[PDB]
Structures are given as structure tokens and as C-alpha cells.
Design a binder for this molecule. Structure first.
Ligand SMILES: [NH3+]C[C@@](O)(c1ccc(Cl)cc1)c1ccc(-c2cn[nH]c2)cc1
Lengths: 337, 20
């Protein structure tokens, strides 16, 4: 049973949520190889764990930059959640630690790169291609939401592809354990639900709206609401009007009208039947949900892979030192990390 | 075309999060 699987998953989660792992490695245990990407207050690097020779991705956050961007509480949420969750399409936090300057989160390496990169290059995905990725997100949200977690950062840039062509969700900077409404304006303009834009209290329904944006973007090659400035994107999002490419199937269009639905009483994911409104929708009729979870479905795209720490599926980023001050920065703010 | 407008737009590259 899904419900029973989730019951047990929650017991596993809560034990770790209530007693988080802390200080489980040190920078000197890793050989830094290549920057895999950047953010406003951090970077992710491919590293090699010396004692095992395993490769990992190491997210490095500058504590001073975290503070200036008012992301202290959000960063503590990310680490606390990531260390407690367990799901095939989430990257396990293997280790975490901090030093005078930085916060460090070490997770499994996904050599296939970002969906974003392949999506833009190839232009768009076929409906079966998009559906395969979509199903993994549906299952991942079903899992996270059952734990009272809201995700809030869904976009192709943050969907990593593994060696078998399956998805890894890795970035939990906006993820929050909340049973009620929440209010933080956060996420990516193109992916914001109307509720967020309108400064309402919102809940996990915003993730199901974001799923609609993602499926649209995956199948069209561009998002449903775009413009040159965020303000113009927000006006499109709130106006309540989406146009579909003529090549979209009738089932795809009907799924999207129900995900990209401004009315919360009608948005799929949000109703009485919850996630089953989505799973049992006609566009997903060919989906074997169990087979997707078990990773027995053949990925329609499987990545070029030459060696263990090969990075050809990632863009090239300027390499910058990892500097560690001789003074501890922001000790109190990050005490629990 | 809508694709042509997207490709010519300033938001085909990686999109940053907003923080408020
Ligand atoms: N896709 C997002 C970002 O580029 C990234 C970079 C910096 C920060 Cl602060 C946040 C996110 C990224 C890149 C690679 C990985 C990754 C690769 N293997 N495992 C995780 C995760 C995130």
C-alpha cells in the first residue's frame, strides 16, 4: 500500500528530524575537482572522498553571504530536512559539516547534469519523455508532502539526471516543514503560483502549480508565462490565461488546465482525492507508478558517461578558492548546523 | 512564433530564485 509505505517512511523521517546528524566529515577528507554550479550564497563542486574514492557533490555555502541574504533559517531547514529524508529521487545527504567560513553538504553525484541543459539544447521533450520525468516529481511530492514538507524550488535547473537517466531533486533551500499556511515570498518567477504573487498565505498546492509549469516547459520547450522582466511574468501568471502549443495532446492540455488552476478548490493535488487525481489522470494512463519508483522503466534519454568523475554534461564555471577565515563567522546563527 | 519570442528573450539562461 502507498499509505502504509508512507506511514513507515514518516516514522523514519521523524526520528532523524528530531535528532539531526551533525559534523559527520571535514573538508580535508575531500579532493575538490570541479565547480558544477553556483548560487547567490554558494556553489556546488564535484569532490572525491579520499578514504573510499567515491565521488560526491559538495554544496558550499558562505555563512556571511547566507546572512546578508536573510537565508539563515532557510539554510537550517535545508540541512535538517536533507539529512532526514530518504527517497529514490532525492539525493541523500551523506555528510555535513561547517568551518569558520562555510557550510558544507555532501550528497550523491548525479553525472547526467541538469535537466535544464538538455531541455534547452534539444529544445523540447516528447510527451512520453516529459511524462517519465513528471511521474518522478509526482511521487517525490507525494512523499515530501506526506512529511508536511513543502518544496518550493521546482525548475529544470534544479532537476539533476543520474547515470540511469532518472531524476534527482537536490536543492532544499526553500523547503520547509509546515503544517499550516506559510507566507515567504520565494521561488523562481516563472514557477510562482498566483497565491504567492498575491501575498496570500499558501500551502503545498504551490508545488502542484509548479509541476504544471514544469510539465508545460518540458513539453513546449518554453514556460507558460514568460517575458523579459519578472513584473511582466507576474502579470501573466495572475491574469489567468495560458495558451498551449498546437502539438500538445488533448490529455496533456487537460492535465495542465487542472494544475495551472488559479482556483484552489479545483487545483489537482489539492482536492479530496489528493495526488490520485493526478496519478489517475488520462495523460498518465501508460504510467506504471510502481515501476517508476522501482526504477525498472527504461529512461527515454540516458546520459553520455565516460568515467566516474566525468563532468561533460555540466557547464564550465570559473573556479574560485575555498577560503577559510582564521576567525569563526556567524557561530551563533548556525550553531545547530 | 512563441518559440522565436522565447529564444530572443532575456530568460533562456539559468533563472535565479527571488528572495524578497
Ligand atoms: N542545479 C543547481 C546547482 O547548480 C546549485 C549550485 C549552487 C547552489 Cl548554492 C545550489 C544549487 C547544483 C548543481 C549540481 C548538483 C548536484 C550534482 N550532483 N549532485 C548534486 C546540485 C545542485
Amino acid at each position: 500500500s502507498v499509505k502504509e509505505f508512507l506511514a513507515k517512511a514518516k516514522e523514519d523521517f521523524l526520528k532523524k528530524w528530531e535528532n539531526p546528524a551533525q559534523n559527520t566529515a571535514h573538508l580535508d577528507q575531500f579532493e575538490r575537482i570541479k565547480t558544477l554550479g553556483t548560487g547567490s550564497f554558494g556553489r556546488v563542486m564535484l569532490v572525491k572522498h579520499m578514504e573510499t574514492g567515491n565521488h560526491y557533490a559538495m554544496k558550499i555555502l558562505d555563512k556571511q553571504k547566507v546572512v546578508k541574504l536573510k537565508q539563515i533559517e532557510h539554510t537550517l531547514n535545508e540541512k535538517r530536512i536533507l539529512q532526514a529524508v530518504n527517497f529514490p529521487f532525492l539525493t541523500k545527504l551523506e555528510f555535513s559539516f561547517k568551518d569558520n567560513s562555510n557550510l558544507y553538504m555532501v550528497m550523491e553525484y548525479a553525472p547526467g547534469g541538469e535537466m535544464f541543459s538538455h531541455l534547452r539544447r534539444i529544445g523540447r521533450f516528447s510527451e512520453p519523455h516529459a511524462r517519465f520525468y513528471a511521474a518522478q516529481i509526482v511521487l517525490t511530492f507525494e512523499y515530501l508532502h506526506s512529511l508536511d514538507l513543502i518544496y518550493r524550488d521546482l525548475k529544470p535547473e534544479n532537476l539533476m539526471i543520474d547515470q540511469q537517466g532518472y531524476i534527482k531533486v537536490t536543492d532544499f533551500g526553500f523547503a520547509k516543514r509546515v503544517k499550516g499556511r506559510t507566507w515567504t515570498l520565494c521561488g523562481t518567477p516563472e514557477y510562482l503560483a498566483p497565491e504567492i504573487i498575491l501575498s496570500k498565505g499558501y500551502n503545498k498546492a504551490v508545488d502542484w502549480w509548479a509541476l504544471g509549469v514544469l510539465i508545460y516547459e518540458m513539453a513546449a520547450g518554453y514556460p507558460p508565462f514568460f517575458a523579459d522582466q519578472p513584473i511582466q511574468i507576474y502579470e501573466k501568471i495572475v491574469s489567468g490565461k495560458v495558451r498551449f502549443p498546437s502539438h500538445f495532446s488533448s490529455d496533456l492540455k487537460d492535465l495542465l488546465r487542472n494544475l495551472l488552476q488559479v482556483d484552489l478548490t479545483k487545483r489537482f493535488g489539492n482536492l479530496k482525492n489528493g495526488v490520485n487525481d493526478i496519478k489517475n489522470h488520462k495523460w498518465f494512463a501508460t504510467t506504471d507508478w510502481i515501476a517508476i519508483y522501482q526504477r525498472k522503466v527504461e529512461a527515454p534519454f540516458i546520459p553520455k558517461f565516460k568515467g566516474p568523475g566525468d563532468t561533460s554534461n555540466f557547464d564550465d564555471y570559473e573556479e574560485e578558492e575555498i577560503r577559510v577565515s582564521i576567525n569563526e563567522k556567524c557561530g551563533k546563527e548556525f550553531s545547530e548546523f | 512564433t512563441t518559440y522565436a519570442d522565447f529564444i530572443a528573450s532575456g530568460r533562456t539562461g539559468r533563472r535565479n530564485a527571488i528572495h524578497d
